[model samples]
Target: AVYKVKLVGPEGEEHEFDAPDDAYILDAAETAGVELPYSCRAGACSTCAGKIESGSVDQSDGSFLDDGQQEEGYVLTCVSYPKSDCVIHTHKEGDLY
Candidate 1:
């Protein structure tokens, strides 16, 4: 199913787009003309990191984030696929520091 993805950037800029369950958020954002910061599209880097303020995603492919981080709503957009409509805060690598 296609889900509505609401991304709040570091500068508080918002981008609304569509994300398919099979498509990663980063890739989906790219398709929707939204530019999000990313380093390794393989999910090994935190440059595409984001936090879910609401909704859920399948990020089991993200190996860089620990279980604790995942549990805390942190996700790697490069590997994360929305399970439902989501509201996320993007470019949150700094928050992990």
Candidate 2:
């Protein structure tokens, strides 16, 4: 099954495309020629905290977010897998902290 995703970039630009339901949001964004924020994609770096504006995902590990101060949308693009068509907001680190 394929699901449509809308990825919002840093400058408020957005790109939408259809992706396999089993694909990761990170790769999907890249395939669409959109630049997103990310660091060491191993799921532990704080730089990979991408915000989810809508829909859901399965993370390799939010244990990395470790803030345990859980929010609805925070995800590590390093290990984010889509659970449904999603809208992800790629924000800068400052706003995340």
Candidate 3:
């Protein structure tokens, strides 16, 4: 299976990519020519944090986000996989993740 992603960034910049259902989201993004801001690939930092404006995904890591945050659609793409076509904002920084 495959899913699509709409990455919205600062300054109204945006990128689009398609990812295999089982592939790591971040990897798929880089392969599609969209360079995102990421300092750590592990779920230890919120540097890779972003908001899922729509659709869903499975996040296996991200010890940083609490239950409340997860409920809010936050994820570290490095350890996440799309569960459906999703629209996300990837340039926000906060304790949300």
TM-score of each: 0.96, 0.80, 0.91
Across 22-79, the per-residue lDDT of candidate 1 in tens digits comes to 9999999999999889987898988999999999999988899989999899999999
Compare candidates 1 and 3 on TM-score and give the better one.
1
| TM-score winner | 1
List clash counts for every candidate, in order.
Answer: 0, 0, 0
Alpha carbon lDDT at 91, candidate 2: 64
Clashes of 1: 0
Who is ahead in lDDT, 1 or 2?
1
Candidate 2 on 1-97: residue-level lDDT in tens? 7788887777778889876766667777788786677777677776766778888788855467654523656788767778788887776455556
Worst 10 residues of 3 by lDDT: 88-97
Error of 1 at 12 (Å): 1.6
lDDT of 3 at 22: 88
lDDT-based ranking: 1, 3, 2
Please give the CA lDDT of all the candidate structures.
Answer: 0.92, 0.72, 0.83
